[PDB]
Design a protein around this nucleic acid. Structure first.
Lengths: 142, 139
DNA sequence: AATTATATTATTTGAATTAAT
DNA sequence: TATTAATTCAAATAATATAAT
């Protein structure tokens, strides 16, 4: 009997565990390291809602995580000029050598994983993530 | 590429769509995931084994099995052979609840895969398998 | 040495709450 | 009023290191 959804959950859990264990020197929590990885790739003109959503945490959690990062000296929250409602999260100068080790390990770990399999598997696999995801979100609106 | 992150996303939205479909049952996601895995796996697959399939730590699974048991859905009994290893299985009373959860999950799995091709399905099932093993080789 | 429990110890959430547009 | 953010704070939720048979 088919168990594909559980097997994608498991796959992701083990992968995530590999990155966390390799970052164990930074003594950084999974939420914190995933959140930093995400702030760096996304623009400040993203809502905390989409950021929180981009990471896989809800909005009430992101703030606290960002409050934590604020007390670690790693981020700041600049209240906007044309949108006083919003705040554009920015990584602090002192964060580079940290963003640098999180990213290096995420990239390296990915390329390893995608280094013994074929281009066809990777491409066909790559496309579907986007197909399956689009389709599920479509049903979401029913 | 953000393949890792794009994949985690699909996992989140697959799970929440199931969670959406199962809402009138009023179980936390943790409860239905666990009930599913208890039914899906051999009863010899015991606490520590159970928790990996569920994804979560065994003490936290200790909390869940207590709640599920107080609700009368599961039995935790001493194996007649060993006095520290326990049998976990569903009650007759959880019979309609699991047909519910299992039905949403299987229908969801069958509908999600749709418009995707047979050779496309074959690769995702086969790649996952490989990648997990690659990840198990690293470590 | 293994299989299940506790116990702090901490985060994750869900419910209104503030605030601007 | 109706909208979209950001936030916050009691009570669930799980985790980490720690037990007990």
């Amino acid at each position: 009997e088919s168990t594909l959804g559980s097997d994608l959950a498991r796959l992701v859990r083990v992968w995530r565990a590999l990155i966390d264990h390799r970052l164990k020197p930074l003594e950084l929590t999974q939420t914190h390291w995933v959140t930093l990885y995400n702030i760096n790739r996304l623009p400040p003109e993203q809502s905390q809602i989409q950021l929180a959503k981009a990471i896989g945490i809800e909005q009430p959690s992101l703030v606290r995580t960002l409050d934590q990062l604020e007390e670690k000296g790693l981020i700041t929250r600049h209240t906007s000029a044309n949108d006083r409602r919003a705040k554009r999260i920015k990584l602090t100068e002192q964060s580079s050598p940290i963003i640098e080790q999180v990213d290096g390990v995420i990239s390296s770990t990915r390329k390893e994983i995608l280094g013994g399999i074929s281009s066809d598997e990777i491409a066909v696999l790559s496309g579907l993530i986007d197909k399956l995801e689009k389709n599920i979100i479509q049903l979401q609106t029913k």
